[PDB]
Structure 1
Amino acid sequence: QPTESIVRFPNINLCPFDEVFNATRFASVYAWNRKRISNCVADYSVLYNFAPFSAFKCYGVSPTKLNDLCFTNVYADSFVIRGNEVSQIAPGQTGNIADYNYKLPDDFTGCVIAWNSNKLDSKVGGNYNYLYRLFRKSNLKPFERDISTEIYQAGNKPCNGVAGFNCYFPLRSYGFRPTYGVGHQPYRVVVLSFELLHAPATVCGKKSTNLVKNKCVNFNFNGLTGTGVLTESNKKFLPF
């Protein structure tokens, strides 16, 4: 019987997660950013080991399972919200963010990751660069982005593009200040979507086991599964 199992996979390119998670400036949530990730290898344990994450939840996958899987594309959506709002970034949620800013589908496949960015995104005197939408006639559909800036009509009289009685500019600034309580402090959020189409899966986590020689083992070479003893060879294989 095979003494032990060895799995061999190419050395293991890189996916540009650093540019998503360590970006200088994040988007406002109403105008959230989407980055397509493709054709690359990702170590997801670099993610789940970065220690200051306040939220990290995966829905149709698991973090340790990720480093073995391949997908067609990964989409990284990113923005800033308040701490108390982080919980709305989840399937089945309602609230100001889920309804009017950024909406996950009930059947979501991926991970929601958040951390406190008070040091980066709060300013003495208030950071007005980050906005959310407070007023909308109906809820967003999943992954809808609404960047319009039309005066919202709360009452019976048309606004005609002028703000006034029951005519409100639809966006507000967060005005993040470092003296705010933690519920009101800015959090950076990354939503990873893992897409599997009928197509080549080119965004790849897997594993590499130490090679053993002259021992009966069950080996996995790049998906070739077999059993036998591996010994030195004199065959001149062509490079391909």
Structure 2
Amino acid sequence: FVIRGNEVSQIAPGQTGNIADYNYKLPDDFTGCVIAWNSNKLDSTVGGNYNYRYRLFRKSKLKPFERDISTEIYQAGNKPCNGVAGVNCYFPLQSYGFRPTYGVGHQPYRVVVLSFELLHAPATVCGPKKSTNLVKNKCVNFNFNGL
């Protein structure tokens, strides 16, 4: 998916930030890689990417492998502000607002979490972008997808 560039500086062990605290909980033993680069010509539109929206704060932190399938009304105050952005109350939903010529510090930065997941089934997925050539009629050592 895509995030704001500044949130890259926010995701850190023991640090604050929107993604770390209110959007995704970092696993204590996370294994994987995050690959990101400027998606100015890919994740942004000339007409304005106003479709994307986010939530500033949530009552409960999202657990790992949990998807927030709820967008209920939020009342941050002790009185019924009825969604009016005012005293002690905030509007839960805000816009992302991505444009092609964004600065690097806040570009639509890519996020590719390749979370290695151990379910109750043997391995069936691989990423073998290393397959070399093959020679014949010579005593060599060979490997075919595990064998």
TM-score w.r.t. the length of structure 1 is 0.48
2:57 paired residue among 115, 127, 135:
135
Query: Runs of 5+ in structure 1 lacking a partner?
Result: 1-78, 225-240
Question: Structure 2 vs 1, CA of residues 215 and 137 (structure 1 numbering), >3 Å: closer, same or farther?
Answer: closer
Residue-by-residue CA offset, 1:36-77 (whole Å, 9 max, x unaligned)? xxxxxxxxxxxxxxxxxxxxxxxxxxxxxxxxxxxxxxxxxx
Give the secondary structure class of the aligned counterpart of 1:221.
Answer: coil
Residue-by-residue CA offset, 1:5-42 (whole Å, 9 max, x unaligned)? xxxxxxxxxxxxxxxxxxxxxxxxxxxxxxxxxxxxxx
* Pairwise CA distance, 1:123: 4.1
Query: Runs of 5+ in structure 2 lacking a partner?
Result: none
> How much is the aligned-residue C-alpha RMSD, in angstroms?
3.4
Tell me which protein shows more strand as a share of its residues.
1
C-alpha separation in 1, matches of 2:40 and 2:11: 19
Question: Structure 2 vs 1, CA of residues 122 and 111 (structure 1 numbering), >3 Å: closer, same or farther?
Answer: same
Contact 1:80–1:188 under 8 Å retained in 2: yes
C-alpha separation in 1, matches of 2:99 and 2:108: 9
Contact 1:149–1:169 under 8 Å retained in 2: no
Matches within 5 A, 1:109-148: 109-124=31-46, 126-148=48-70
Residue-by-residue CA offset, 1:57-109 (whole Å, 9 max, x unaligned)? xxxxxxxxxxxxxxxxxxxxxx2111121345566554111222233311212
* Pairwise CA distance, 1:175: 1.2
Question: Structure 2 vs 1, CA of residues 149 and 163 (structure 1 numbering), >3 Å: closer, same or farther?
Answer: farther
Give the secondary structure class of the aligned counterpart of 1:87.
Answer: helix
Give the secondary structure class of the aligned counterpart of 2:21.
Answer: helix
* Pairwise CA distance, 1:166: 3.3
Contact 1:83–1:183 under 8 Å retained in 2: yes
Tell me which protein shows more helix as a share of its residues.
1
Larger Rg: 1
Residue-by-residue CA offset, 1:105-130 (whole Å, 9 max, x unaligned)? 11212222222212233345642122
Contact 1:114–1:189 under 8 Å retained in 2: yes
TM-score w.r.t. the length of structure 2 is 0.71
Contact 2:38–2:108 under 8 Å retained in 1: yes
Question: Structure 2 vs 1, CA of residues 91 and 191 (structure 1 numbering), >3 Å: closer, same or farther?
Answer: farther
Question: Structure 2 vs 1, CA of residues 202 and 172 (structure 1 numbering), >3 Å: closer, same or farther?
Answer: same
Q: How many residues align?
A: 146
